[PDB]
Write a protein that binds this ligand. Structure first.
Ligand code: NAP
Ligand code: NAP
Ligand code: NAP
Ligand code: NAP
Ligand code: NAP
Ligand code: ADQ
Ligand code: ADQ
Ligand code: ADQ
Ligand code: ADQ
Ligand code: ADQ
Lengths: 307, 272, 300, 273, 300
């Protein structure tokens, strides 16, 4: 079987779907279903079992076996860039990850986890997977940063696969539960569908990010499992587009819409990345030979799905 | 002895009553009496013992023996479609049932549990017990659906009886504690004081004991096979439901089900 | 040593008093003193030790020994007919009693507990100790009923004493902490002393109950311990008297007052003592007039 | 070392001070410092260590050793007469004390604890250390009473010292943290700055050390033996009437005199400045 | 491996930085990150691992091994002078410290901890490291004082290094999380940057403290680790400067600003460095002018 933590979440459920598409249905999903609405991410999919993240951690630490485990896609984490409880952050993200990494290392089970482009911090170019280029602006980013550092210590003598993917701005199907953390594209679609005005922060024409479609994120994940390469790789399209571009593509699909500019949130001031662009040199060097959908291509496919 | 989980609840207490009618009183009721008003479902009945759902799970997991257990009717669950705490939902419903299932499998104790027509979701026809017809609209429905999928993985090599009943719109005596989740017929009665497959609890209890006596395994729809309107109930989200009884009849259960008109008048003649 | 659970409570402290009255002082009282005012039921008494109901259960369940235990009078329970948390009710009353029962059975220690006439629910007549006559109206009544059914299954092969007493409307010393649940005699006394009108519900004549004096309740308990008989027995006088008769006896001692009848339920209870007498207990029971005058003397 | 429970409190800190005055500083103070202001009662004193009352009980019950313990002055307790949670009261006072008593009995460590005149309830005369004179008016008094009864059962066959002191109305230094529960003399002093048996703490501390040095066991009233009015306390700056009967105290051998209200209060007013 | 408790805090993160500057990156930081904004004190540094203070205590007390531990810099504590829950203070500060001291003593791991000048209380002169000079004014000062007294009992027969540093008025990079508890220099800088007025208490011209730069605090810490000397030492510059001088240096840097003396302890502090120099620590300490200007260049 394959274990997908964060399996009821955005990226996790898309990995489960990609596995289903490849004829794999022996899957254990580990998540936190407190917010029961997340179940829709799993309804049309096929899995073998479900376990809560707290029970799973207890069993992992107790050395329990879950069967013939072929890989663990660790997507589970608190992903809110605006969550400031650092005790919880380091516990749920950092410590939880180390616990799983060791469990897999002992049993030589491939470990593929989720890192974040938030690790780069206030950068304007050179988004390269190296400590000198890393300086997070929030605890969330720090929890991700510190685990990558921990993995870099472990890599030299690991006897099984360990891969971390620094996702950039992921968007696409199955993120409806994310609320305020859902992608801007999702937000714009609900605003337009509720008759409200589509909104963007003041400064969005100069605010650029590397938006990647989830479908591509799932594909990179499965490719790495099939190919066994280890390391920490940036996962983005390699091209930064403005938030305005995301809006343009979405408002084109809707045939209506006039963007309203909202004042920049105070809680984000000093904690925000105004520009991100993945450097795919290492990803390509690892052998990943597939293309990435553009914002225009990915956003129109997503909007068709949302409606 | 026979263990009935959810025994102080609607369907469970009706199963205890049906057992009492067949001269069986050596029954262990497992439930959650936080809402003490449910004790009335049990007052006029005869059971051997009562245990809280949390204590029972601790003992089940500890591998404790409860005596000469002849069967477990697992009716206990959070049956609210409006309950959105999925952590609790998956634990109380899904995980709890797996724990019980394994306990019974190891000891070859017949396991008869409660599924739900909510597994079908927004469906308009073809309510057949197969994964392609299932797509719940809420976590409650999901916890039920996922356990059915788990049982389907277990069925091929099980050495003892496993039966799940997909109840449709059950109504009848002993549901007063359900509040907003009580049947529309109950609501109308207390108020005065879309088509669904409405089934009388009496028939539900009968199907349960019939399967225990016949030992057949599987997942079966439990409804009348006839969809009637809420208006019909009054005269006496899934928008339309109607059980496909092909598998139930094929298992050998050929007995008829009371209509809304027959069941609702017998029910009012009880509530009053 | 004798263990009295509910010992800081109404009936339990009266059992401690009765034991003291014969010179017995080696007593372990188990209760819940969260409501500290209950300490008065114990100040004038003589006991060996005190333990909270939670710690006691933990020790019982762990199989600890408490010394030379000659009996356990289990009076401890939640007695509120208005308490609807059935999870607590079934745990504190039903489950706790089973735990104690088993502990005593394993060690052959006499077990005398408290049942309740609430098991009869809305019964009007024929208050006999048999399942056909039982149908409680609330969870409290149900927790008591079910434990009696459990004891009935255990009785046939028990090797030591098991006795349950279905108390009716008990009244007498040490029920002051019960508030609105205290006896009408207690309420009337408070009123007369506060200078208010002794109050009775409209048409209180014709409203009858089997009012029993706690002193007689305590005596039945000690008699059964001394005689070793097992079973479930009604504990009442066998005579139903009206609330009016209780008021009459109250003013007859107080030498004052004029009853005021307030506005607006069992209109009748009377214990059938056939089984109690058949078990061997034959002492008389104080009448309302006798018991109430004695009670008032203590209250004042 | 000497263990003083209630050591950051009124009477306890005074016992620590008395020990300091005799060259003893190897002291373990056990208290509850939730009210951090109680630290002042110990700033100017010399102790060896501090431990929270909860941790101490856990170690006592686990049978841990604390070093070479020569005595335990158990002053720690909830002393609020207006505190009605009897579950807490019986646990914190009654049960806690039994736990300590047994620990000391098994190791033959002298056990000197605090009782209370509240055990006499609303009494008017004959304050004598015997059960017939005791009838507390609140759970506080009851938790104290019942532990004295427990000690009386234990006394006949104890192989080490057990002493309980029935303190009457104590007043003096280190009670500032007590708030409304502080002595009337303390209250009057605060205000100006903006019949019962009153005993000075200094005397209370002295009696405590005397018994440890002399090893006598028993339960003894600790008061001056004379009842003075609150008016008297005022001039110098529910139990109605209290007056300790010192027959048993003198009989045990403690002959020393007690400061009167006028003497004790003027000395106290002096320290409070 | 070196363990730095309080590592995400002010002094602790500066010690981690000083370790990094000397090539040491194998560091375990133990802290409480509930206030997640403290992460910034660590983003630019290099450590080996992070652990919460509660989990660390459980492991310490369980006797767990953390690897090859060559020293523990115990800077973690509740540093609020206005915190009055003494149960917590004594637990988190005093007890937690004893727990760590014993763990280190058993394994002979050098233990360097943080004391406080608050142990002197309201003292005006003679800030010497001896009991006669100590008399704290709050529980925080008392928890620090009592641990120093405990260490003094332990010192005579210790077989490994134990050093405590009584820090005076520390100021410098990485204290932004402290809020109201941060240094006046920090405060003045945030105000000059909020376009508004720098506030100083009226009479600041005569409010003097031994202000010490964190950089020098970290240097003392590493020097003692390198030299293995034990004891309790004052950590200040030995010179008392006014709050006005602090302000002068700030405004000199900002090339602007006008001081508004707002309405409104320890009006004088000055470390006696006799024992510090006698231990062998001979380096000079930055003055307020030197330290404050360097601090401004960093804050901007
Ligand atoms: N644009 C993006 O989505 C993006 C960009 C960069 C990095 N990432 C990383 O990608 C991963 C998945 O992100 P997502 O967008 O798919 O998030 P998501 O929708 O929030 O899914 C993560 C799921 O995991 C649960 N969870 C939290 N901690 C867990 C744990 N320790 N073990 C198992 N489940 C846990 C969460 O529930 P609770 O949180 O309620 O417990 C949530 O349902 C995370 O590690 C995130 O940091 C995402
Ligand atoms: N129309 C219907 O009644 C209908 C339709 C479809 C499916 N079903 C299924 O039929 C079964 C019985 O339904 P019902 O209408 O009779 O409901 P019900 O009256 O609510 O009875 C279920 C009882 O079990 C308790 N319980 C909950 N979780 C339990 C557990 N894990 N173990 C033991 N007891 C537990 C409940 O208390 P708490 O929930 O308060 O803990 C409640 O008293 C359920 O499994 C339900 O999902 C019913
Ligand atoms: N007329 C009557 O008095 C009457 C009539 C019928 C039946 N009974 C039965 O007679 C018994 C005594 O009644 P009462 O009037 O004397 O009541 P009571 O005044 O309420 O005394 C019972 C005492 O026991 C405590 N307690 C509760 N659960 C306990 C447990 N599991 N173990 C030990 N102590 C426990 C109660 O405290 P908390 O409840 O605060 O925990 C209370 O202080 C009860 O079992 C009652 O059901 C009495
Ligand atoms: N006039 C009098 O002062 C008087 C008269 C009669 C009897 N007594 C008795 O004399 C003793 C000391 O009285 P006091 O006036 O000096 O009181 P106090 O100022 O309140 O000192 C007692 C201290 O002990 C603490 N404590 C409570 N339970 C404890 C336990 N189980 N172990 C250790 N410490 C505990 C208290 O904290 P918390 O209470 O906040 O937990 C408090 O700081 C008490 O036993 C009291 O009942 C005093
Ligand atoms: N001016 C000064 O800086 C000064 C003057 C005199 C003495 N000191 C002492 O210097 C040391 C460092 O002070 P600081 O100014 O750098 O303070 P700080 O920034 O508050 O750093 C202390 C850090 O440790 C945490 N912590 C608290 N208790 C802990 C424990 N038991 N184990 C691990 N971490 C713990 C605190 O979090 P929580 O408290 O939120 O849990 C905080 O993040 C402290 O011991 C302080 O008492 C400092
Ligand atoms: N220019 C703009 N105009 C309008 N709205 C804007 C905006 N920029 C941001 N927002 C909105 O406000 C939130 C603030 O997001 P952040 O910039 O802090 O993080 P990020 O966009 O990298 O989020 C992402 O990264 C984290 C993990 O790295 C995921 O958890 C999250 O779902 C993902 O969108 C966003 O989730 C978005 O919904
Ligand atoms: N058409 C209708 N008319 C009146 N009441 C209805 C109704 N449909 C549902 N309700 C009431 O409100 C609740 C709605 O719940 P659901 O329809 O989700 O669940 P159900 O158990 O009926 O399947 C029911 O319990 C019922 O009592
Ligand atoms: N005539 C009157 N005049 C003035 N005040 C009155 C009154 N009758 C009752 N009250 C007061 O108001 C309340 C009415 O309650 P119930 O009579 O139903 O309770 P009770 O405890 O007497 O009997 C319960 O307990 C006994 C024995 O356990 C059962 O026999 C019985 O059916 C059950 O209701 C009582 O608490 C009482 O103090
Ligand atoms: N005569 C008096 N005048 C003013 N205040 C008084 C007083 N008598 C009592 N008080 C105050 O109220 C409290 C009364 O004390 P208690 O009667 O409860 O008992 P005790 O003094 O033994 O303690 C005292 O703490 C005191 O502060
Ligand atoms: N002279 C001054 N001018 C402005 N603010 C001052 C000041 N002196 C003190 N403060 C502020 O008020 C607090 C003074 O409190 P304490 O003296 O207890 O702190 P400290 O840590 O300096 O010792 C400081 O946190 C500081 O922010």
């Amino acid at each position: 079987m394959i274990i997908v933590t964060g399996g009821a979440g955005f990226i996790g459920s898309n990995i489960v779907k990609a596995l289903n598409d490849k004829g794999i249905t022996d899957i254990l999903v580990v998540d936190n279903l407190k917010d029961g609405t997340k179940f829709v991410n799993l309804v049309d999919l096929n899995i073998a079992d479900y376990m809560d993240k707290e029970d799973f951690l207890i069993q992992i630490m107790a050395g329990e076996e879950f069967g013939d485990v072929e890989a663990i896609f660790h997507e589970g984490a608190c992903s809110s860039t605006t969550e400031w409880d650092g005790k919880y952050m380091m516990d749920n993200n950092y410590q939880y990850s180390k616990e799983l990494l060791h469990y897999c290392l002992e049993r030589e089970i491939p470990f593929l986890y989720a890192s974040s482009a938030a690790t780069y911090g206030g950068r304007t170019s050179d988004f390269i997977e190296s400590r000198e280029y890393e300086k997070p602006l929030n605890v969330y980013g720090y929890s991700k940063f510190l685990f990558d550092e921990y993995v870099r210590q472990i890599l030299p003598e690991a006897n099984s696969q360990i891969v971390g993917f620094r996702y950039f701005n992921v968007y696409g199907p199955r993120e409806g539960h994310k609320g305020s953390m859902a992608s801007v594209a999702f937000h714009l679609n609900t605003q337009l569908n509720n008759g409200e005005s589509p909104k963007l922060f003041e400064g969005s024409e100069n605010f650029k990010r590397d938006f990647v479609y989830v479908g591509d994120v799932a594909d990179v994940n499965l490719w790495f499992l099939e190919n066994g390469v280890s390391g920490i790789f940036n996962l983005g399209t390699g091209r930064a587009e403005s938030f305005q571009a995301v809006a343009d593509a979405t408002l084109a699909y809707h045939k209506k819409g006039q963007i309203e500019y909202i004042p920049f949130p105070d809680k984000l001031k000093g904690r925000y990345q105004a520009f991100t662009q993945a450097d795919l040199t290492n990803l390509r060097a690892a052998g990943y030979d597939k293309p990435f959908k553009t914002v225009a291509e990915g956003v129109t496919e997503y909007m068709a799905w949302l409606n």
